[PDB]
Amino acid sequence: NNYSYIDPTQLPYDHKWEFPRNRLSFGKTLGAGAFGKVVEATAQGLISDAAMTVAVKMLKPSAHSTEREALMSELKVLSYLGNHENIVNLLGACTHGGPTLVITEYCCYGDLLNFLRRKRDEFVPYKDFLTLEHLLSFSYQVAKGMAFLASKNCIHRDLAARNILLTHGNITKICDRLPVKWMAPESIFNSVYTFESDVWSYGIFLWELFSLGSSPYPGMPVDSKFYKMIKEGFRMSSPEYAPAEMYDIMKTCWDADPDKRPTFKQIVQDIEKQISE
Numbered sequence: 001n002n003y004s005y006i007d008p009t010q011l012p013y014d015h016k017w018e019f020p021r022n023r024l025s026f027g028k029t030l031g032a033g034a035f036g037k038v039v040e041a042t043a044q045g046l047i048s049d050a051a052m053t054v055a056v057k058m059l060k061p062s063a064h065s066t067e068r069e070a071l072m073s074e075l076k077v078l079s080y081l082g083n084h085e086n087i088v089n090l091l092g093a094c095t096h097g098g099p100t101l102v103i104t105e106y107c108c109y110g111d112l113l114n115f116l117r118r119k120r121d122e123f124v125p126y127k128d129f130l131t132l133e134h135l136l137s138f139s140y141q142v143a144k145g146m147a148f149l150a151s152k153n154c155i156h157r158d159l160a161a162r163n164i165l166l167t168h169g170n171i172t173k174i175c176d177r178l179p180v181k182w183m184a185p186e187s188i189f190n191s192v193y194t195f196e197s198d199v200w201s202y203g204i205f206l207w208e209l210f211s212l213g214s215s216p217y218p219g220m221p222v223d224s225k226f227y228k229m230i231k232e233g234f235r236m237s238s239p240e241y242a243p244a245e246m247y248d249i250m251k252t253c254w255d256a257d258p259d260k261r262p263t264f265k266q267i268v269q270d271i272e273k274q275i276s277e
């Protein structure tokens with residue numbers, strides 16, 4: 001017991017992140033749910049004389065102790081992770097003088113799914129239109145983000161286009177009852193979530209991407225037949241504009257044996273080779 005893994009959620013909050021509540025002005029609500037809301041805000045002097053747009057996550061009024069501790073643990077996890085270009089990074093927090101506020105980067109173009117759908121009419125494979133080069137970049141960037149998360153012992157558990165955000169410079173950033181159509185069979189059948197199950201979900205994301213935001217398994221409801229087909233080995237066919245080499249990645253991501261799926265590190269190297277050619 002002399003050597004143990006350091007659990008980042010057990011570490012104390014680092015006040016280098018602290019930011020004055022009075023220097024935040026809330027704007028539009030970016031997301032709202034049962035647990036609380038995420039708002040766009042202006043943070044004055046976050047990086048001294050200038051204000052920057054940020055996102056602020058906050059809990060519901062007078063939240064129970066378990067909910068507040070969960071937000072703090074999520075804050076602590078972000079602090080230990082460190083910065084990466086392809087994740088929504090932590091920028092600061094307000095932990096006293098009121099409820100806990102978590103300040104992260106703001107992604108001006110919103111979620112990738114709605115972006116793909118609103119760019120679908122304008123899409124052309126080869127050349128401000130969306131192109132195959134853009135889709136390849138999005139696939140590469142999401143793989144780099146997940147490879148970074150995986151190397152840090154993190155599992156996303158809800159990887160999907162709706163949970164990818166797009167910001168300036170065509171940079172995609174990963175953010176955050178069950179998303180059945182994105183889940184690996186072992187997650188559905190055994191409630192197991194692993195590095196390998198995240199890879200399965202990334203394959204579903206690729207199908208979303210090259211389908212320009214179509215819903216997976218189109219026209220198929222989630223029922224007994226769906227689960228039986230998935231278990232028996234049924235997989236989605238290729239989107240019309242997915243390069244063959246990208247569909248190959250999708251198929252390996254969807255291997256029934258989690259051990260035969262690629263790692264995100266391998267996916268990154270594969271996509272890097274495609275981008276050069």
Ligand SMILES: C=CC(=O)N[C@@](C)(c1ccc(F)cc1)c1cnc(N2CCN(c3ncnn4cc(-c5cnn(C)c5)cc34)CC2)nc1
Pocket residue numbers: 030031032033034035036037038055057058059060071088104105106107108109110111165175176
């Ligand atoms: C029932 C469930 C539930 O409680 N859910 C949540 C409410 C929750 C809230 C507080 C909690 F304490 C716990 C959980 C919850 C709700 N929403 C979100 N997200 C995540 C981060 N999103 C963005 N982050 C950074 N930049 N950015 C730019 C845009 C953008 C730009 N243009 N447009 C149109 C949108 C969006 C973002 C914002 C929305 N996260 C989480």
Ligand SMILES: [Br-]
Pocket residue numbers: 217218235236237
């Ligand atoms: Br299909």
